[PDB]
DNA sequence: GAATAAGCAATTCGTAATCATGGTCATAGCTCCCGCG
DNA sequence: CGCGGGAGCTATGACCATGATTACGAATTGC
């Protein structure tokens, strides 16, 4: 791996797809909330808590400083 | 006003620029017919044969066509007589006076009218004979009148017997009014309504009507 | 060629050339025969033969401003532009609809009065008409050298329906806003629906039509028919709020492709509601639109020109109303009364049995000719004793199907008219 | 005082006079002058009120006037057709008079002179000399034509005088121009009043030097210096051009019966008068028989406008303004009117006319001797070839080989000719007088005495060729027939189309029947259906087909149905089925089926669904009686046609019976012609409707018809399709044939009346005998009243390309198995004049090839298409590369007219550019050769546009340049399209058509 | 069945939108009809991609 | 409904709602792609029927608006 | 029941991403580091909105 | 000086207006890439 | 942290070129 340009291009192309997928999950969540069915999100609350925790340590460790 | 040189007869032909696309063919036919034409004493003088070549053709929309000049005293302009002794122009003036009401006139002249070109089919004739030089003027008459009917809107012919073949002698279609000759018997030229028919057919073609009172000479 | 009669024919050719956009198909064919005569006689001529002529009077009418504007000083005669179908009556002397160019059948007293009006002045290009609720109103009268108010009084003498002509005097640069538009519309004081007003100078042609409105879109509750004659019904379309949107013809319903529970392009006015002259963009064909309209109104209604017409038990009453005579119960006193009335007797002489029976029940011409052309007849002594239909392809048309349903009543009236014609002149 | 009428001719100017040219039995020419009046027909009250009184009035009898106006009725309250029976008067006015409400104005004053005075224009009369007064020597005046022309004696022969002439003019340009070009040779065929036929050619001595002139004198030719020194007996006379033109003026001023030329009014006589008034100022002065007035020879242009489309000016004929009574006859206009050929130039007309089959007696290196007799060709063909060969110089062997005559011997019953011919394999060849292997302008450049004598021979051949075409077409017999039947002057017989030649016997009828046909409303024209043309059931016929043709179908339809404008009771139309059924029931109960015929037609208007025309068959109509007159004349000339032995009289009588057939169909056609006085739209529409029902009746009785055990069964009943009649309707018809005949009939094709009946037999004699039995049985049982079918011929090897396009071998009714078949082409590429000779020859060769390898039958049709298309590609590439075939194989032809909807039509544009750029003018109605010519550097063109821009008008002086070439691609495309129409096998033909012309070929659908 | 009720809400809301399209599409001008037709082509792209994901996997 | 005029605000509202409907169906499509890439076994015959009815409804709405003249 | 296993797959995917970031992130260079920092802030905004949608009830 | 004319059917060939199909081009969505306060 | 400027992509309606379809007239012939 030389000059690290390909890795940056790959992570930009991946992270925009990740953003579109996250907005897609939010949109289908709004759809199933507007459908009128009763749902519980406690396991997904634990999941969003642990992924938010790990990505906050990633954000703390990714800074250029 | 371009000019060409010919071998004999007037030795020059003066013509307007609208007459240009039929000029070389005119020289081609005139160079063969004029040598035989010059022996007979013609009713107009040879220098007045192509006076009407000098007239333009864009402003003209009505061709008042005769078959030939007068047998005597041809002035080179069709239906023109300053002496006003010609029956044809007398009864043309009578018809125009019966139309427009202008009866106090010294004479009439079809050349001074805007939009009217006076034409003789055969450009000359023998002194004292009608349609004598038809033999010399066939191809020239066909050429020049087809050139006229390309530009003008309405063609008016002063004769039934003379212009019965005018739909074949001209190949491009044009508004042709085969009227009676003024000297035709039974006062057929007194009865007919050809000049207002010219005006109505001009208004059908969305053209400016001929004011026939411009031709009167006072 | 050269005679006086040829000059006369050429002058008529020029006169119908100047009124190509205004003439009926009879006068268009007369113009075409004159073009053929001038082509055979004068070889080339300026005018050609015409196959399809778009009927438009927009050469004599200015573009509609649709905004408030300052009025120049001068004399003004404001005329109410009504809602119904604009008809013009040229020197060919038949009714001409704008945008179609088809002659349309009218009551004979109106036709004779318009014949008298055109006999009064030959300088009139045409008379502009309203066909709304089957009542013929002169929009306007366009003449080269005469003010239209003289024609309005002259036709008021003959009995035509004439609007309230108003001549108002303007001396300053007055702004023509919507309020003065409402003042002038109520100054007309007509119950008749007006879409706009057109004004004319005293000495200067090229009429302007001024129209203040707003393009609106109201949700449609239903389509309701309203009786305007013995058999014919005007089309009307209703919003959910209860406001009534007026419809010009049934061809206005199919052309706008109106159905229930859909937004429509309506021109709101101060009082009336005006449905716009637009082509429907729903891409449904004309026949299916007719089918859906007849289904949502009722299968007893059929498209008859501009209006729906009803069906039912049709006897001597509608025959007497068609003949415009007093009511007779049996055949014999009916023939005796027709012998009493010479003009009605002459009308029955000039009009055939099928035409009398078709106009008696209010059937259209083309649809009924198409329906009769697809069935068979067992006929004994000029009477329809039995009928059966061969082609069921015409029965998809709900108008043709409705007339086929009322064909028994048509047979009864046809046999009655046949008996009347038999004992009148045989 | 016995005379025979030669010509009738009117005076023009001063007093209106009518003259008769006549000869007595001794040969002395007698002229009778008449006061020629303007004839008008008025009623009794209008005659009593004419403001000035008439010059002469004749009681015409109580004559009915019927208003022939076709007003459609939507019911059966048809008001009676307006008949006003009143006493009538014939107003004879010396000047033209405008009379209000005057009737019978469509007829001419000359026909009114004939019929009211009882004079037949082709008649022999004993003239009462008490009614004749002598004006001068040879001319008389007759004021009373009833009493003088009362005794009609039978026919006697007269010594007719003739002047056949042709002139030859020197041209160094493309065409002679009389202002610059002299006249080289004028030849005259003087046939005087004693029958002496003098053949003499005048040679211009101004083209020859004095030593050359002396050499011509030493060769036996005569030198003259003036008009008085001229000897008509000397066959070769040298003179100056002034003396030559004075001889021409002296001959044309003679009161001949007939001055007959070919293209002579347009070129020869016009050039004579033009050069005469140039060189000496003299004019050829025609004198009246009383010599009251004198006119000069001025060729007046007379133009026939078309009657279809924009009615443009479609034909130009040129005539002579003569008042002496000589019928100056142009054969060029006459053969354009009568014949249908690619070119109407004299070489093409003599190619078509004097074509004979000759066998070879002696074969040499360069001299082939041909003989022709009654055994080589038909009888009279070899005698005509000998009589043409008496003055001929070149004989065209077969079609493309031109051979100079070396020695000519005129036998007793044919010809023996030695020709400059290469050695040829076949023993018998077609001999004809076609083109010449000369270049006229080039042998004008090196003009010497041998050229002068050869062109004297060619010019005397053309002048005598006028006589040979005169007697070949039988123009004097045709003139007599036209004068007798059409009631017209002998000069006025041929110059007019159908309507004028109708107007004579029509007026004879209307005076006999006492009927006047008038109109009030304007006549309306609608498109109406015509004849029924069936689709061909299969393309190829290895089986015999029997051809049954109705004898004058549309005249017999008109006579049977009484289809006249005045016998039309009314036209019942219906916009709907209800009033259609009401009107049908009222039609059955109101109009009886025998007295009235009710003709169901397709509607004139789209709103109508039915149109029934009712015709009253109680009074015989004007159109049926006129048609009975014309088929009486046609049956008379068919009777002389069957009684004619020589091919000359056979061709003349066949042409005259065809002419009467055409005028009988023209009686029909004027009822469909809106500008005719006899226009009756319901009658012509009912004529085609009754004709179509006759077609369907004869088709339905013959389709599925079988003959078995001597008993012939028609598939449908023998019912009259219009009404119930007393004749039997049983299809089981007794024959006069052997019992063992078991044959089936299938109507495969019908082209209007002619139905093509395919018998399963292939024997010629059996098919001819069976079809004669079918014709007799149909005429006795199937048909009715005037309807009679005729078995024309047996068509073997019928190759039906499409409707009206078939190729077959004909076995006529008088023929048998041993008789030679005649190859009849009808509407194919061989007949069509817009199809080149290369196309015709290649399609004939490839049709013969296809017939051969279809008669082989051992190999599949896909390989038939492959082999024929491969041979086609090889032949077309060989023609494109080698270019051995000349321009004469690739000249198309079409007629020049002005009848064009567009003023910028490319054909009219091309002819006008030719007339501007070349001294040869193409008149209206002239046939010109045109070819598709492109520059030679242009390669093979796949995607092809602007085809009409490559057209070039080709004449006799045209030579294809080195830079120019024939555009072979359009001829090859048309030939390939015709061949792939013949070949079927559509997919591979599309592949070959795209690989060679890059387009989709048009395939005919059956 | 969260995706099933999501698609049920999708088809119900889209049925309401198509009902409004049926209400207003008779009087639509050309440019807005072209815009809603563009959105309908994007609709067809979305449901063909969903068809590909439920067919191929 | 009421008395509405000048449909371009209604056109923008219908296009915005159709944008929402497109984002919702693309959302469920890419999360279906993600859960199919996860590896769980799914049976989607009723899903295919729902897509077929959705496509029929969409082309029913389509056929009234696309074609001019 | 498909959303929880899809979320588990996303947990595995982000675990892979965080492990490879910890592998490679010894040098990042400043402009792409600022770009992925702004990407992480936009991602934090999106996850905050989804947290609001799961806590709104 | 001025004073007629036959119809329709059917086939082929060429020209020109019309339309199906495909290539291309402005343009609206449309969606990320980057950036600056 | 949040919205504006910008650039690349993807279709998409519209315009135009090319070639096949068809009406339209001429030309001919058969009838
Ligand atoms: C030739 C020709 C014919 N017709 C009409 C008229 C009838 C039908 C059939 O006539 P046909 O020549 O086949 O046979 P037909 O003449 O009827 O039978 P004959 O040869 O007279 O026995 O066509 C026509 O109108 N003009 C024409 O020039
Ligand atoms: Mg026949």
XYZ file of C-alpha atoms in Angstrom, chain C residues 206-348:
143
model
C -60.838 45.145 -34.138
C -62.855 44.414 -31.006
C -61.135 43.660 -27.697
C -62.518 41.036 -25.320
C -61.598 41.792 -21.702
C -61.873 38.997 -19.129
C -61.149 39.270 -15.398
C -61.286 35.889 -13.674
C -59.074 33.483 -11.765
C -58.218 29.963 -12.868
C -59.588 27.739 -10.113
C -59.714 24.019 -9.345
C -62.659 22.727 -7.301
C -63.275 19.099 -6.368
C -66.308 17.679 -8.167
C -69.170 15.999 -6.318
C -71.366 14.836 -9.210
C -72.697 15.659 -12.677
C -76.344 16.762 -12.662
C -78.700 17.190 -15.628
C -81.224 20.048 -15.645
C -84.267 20.224 -17.903
C -84.158 23.006 -20.512
C -86.705 21.727 -23.022
C -89.333 19.126 -23.775
C -86.682 16.397 -23.963
C -83.238 18.006 -23.831
C -81.211 18.449 -20.631
C -78.312 20.863 -20.072
C -75.160 19.368 -18.522
C -74.135 20.798 -15.166
C -71.349 19.742 -12.817
C -71.439 20.291 -9.052
C -68.694 20.789 -6.481
C -68.689 19.289 -2.994
C -69.334 22.740 -1.501
C -72.573 23.102 -3.484
C -71.350 25.687 -5.996
C -72.617 24.898 -9.496
C -70.128 24.948 -12.367
C -71.874 25.579 -15.676
C -70.972 23.387 -18.661
C -71.310 24.706 -22.214
C -72.253 21.497 -24.066
C -72.023 17.767 -23.619
C -69.025 18.075 -25.972
C -67.631 20.362 -23.278
C -67.985 17.428 -20.836
C -66.202 14.906 -23.076
C -63.630 17.475 -24.277
C -62.737 18.413 -20.695
C -62.964 14.690 -19.697
C -64.966 15.468 -16.538
C -65.665 12.635 -14.137
C -66.747 12.584 -10.505
C -64.313 13.169 -7.604
C -61.746 14.974 -9.793
C -60.414 18.517 -9.909
C -61.510 20.507 -12.968
C -60.218 23.730 -14.527
C -62.911 26.282 -13.652
C -62.882 30.039 -14.305
C -64.477 31.669 -11.266
C -66.425 34.872 -11.846
C -68.195 37.276 -9.498
C -71.409 35.208 -9.599
C -71.169 32.424 -12.191
C -68.751 29.499 -12.413
C -67.275 28.814 -15.849
C -65.675 25.542 -16.911
C -62.674 26.129 -19.159
C -62.363 25.185 -22.839
C -59.552 22.655 -22.470
C -58.662 19.196 -23.717
C -58.706 16.582 -20.970
C -55.291 15.106 -20.207
C -56.580 11.840 -18.715
C -55.938 10.006 -22.044
C -59.297 8.196 -21.896
C -60.961 7.806 -25.281
C -64.143 9.673 -26.213
C -66.330 6.556 -26.256
C -65.324 5.389 -22.776
C -65.789 8.941 -21.447
C -69.310 8.906 -22.942
C -69.885 5.457 -21.378
C -68.790 6.604 -17.910
C -70.813 9.841 -18.130
C -73.984 7.977 -19.171
C -73.329 5.389 -16.435
C -72.990 8.037 -13.713
C -76.021 10.032 -14.948
C -78.368 7.294 -16.157
C -78.893 5.000 -19.120
C -82.085 6.817 -20.179
C -80.027 9.797 -21.419
C -78.353 9.974 -24.826
C -75.994 12.515 -26.371
C -78.079 14.693 -28.718
C -75.902 17.443 -30.161
C -75.102 19.785 -27.280
C -77.498 18.274 -24.719
C -78.576 15.000 -23.182
C -82.093 13.918 -24.103
C -84.410 11.602 -22.197
C -86.405 8.550 -23.289
C -89.749 7.170 -22.199
C -93.263 6.329 -23.349
C -93.560 8.493 -26.468
C -97.022 8.980 -27.957
C -99.183 11.680 -29.538
C -98.142 14.390 -27.043
C -94.555 14.761 -28.287
C -95.795 14.551 -31.885
C -98.067 17.535 -31.196
C -95.234 19.381 -29.424
C -92.922 18.730 -32.388
C -95.633 19.932 -34.778
C -96.289 22.915 -32.410
C -100.052 22.384 -32.739
C -102.893 21.665 -30.322
C -103.018 18.303 -28.613
C -105.003 15.451 -30.201
C -105.702 12.059 -28.640
C -106.435 9.962 -31.750
C -105.058 9.839 -35.279
C -108.230 11.070 -36.996
C -108.622 14.431 -35.250
C -104.854 14.925 -35.627
C -105.138 14.599 -39.426
C -108.211 16.868 -39.337
C -106.273 19.536 -37.403
C -103.350 19.214 -39.840
C -105.869 19.782 -42.650
C -106.986 22.892 -40.738
C -103.424 24.293 -40.493
C -101.961 24.870 -43.953
C -98.401 25.702 -42.871
C -98.028 22.546 -40.760
C -99.539 20.548 -43.649
C -96.931 22.031 -46.011
C -94.194 21.231 -43.464
C -95.341 17.589 -43.328
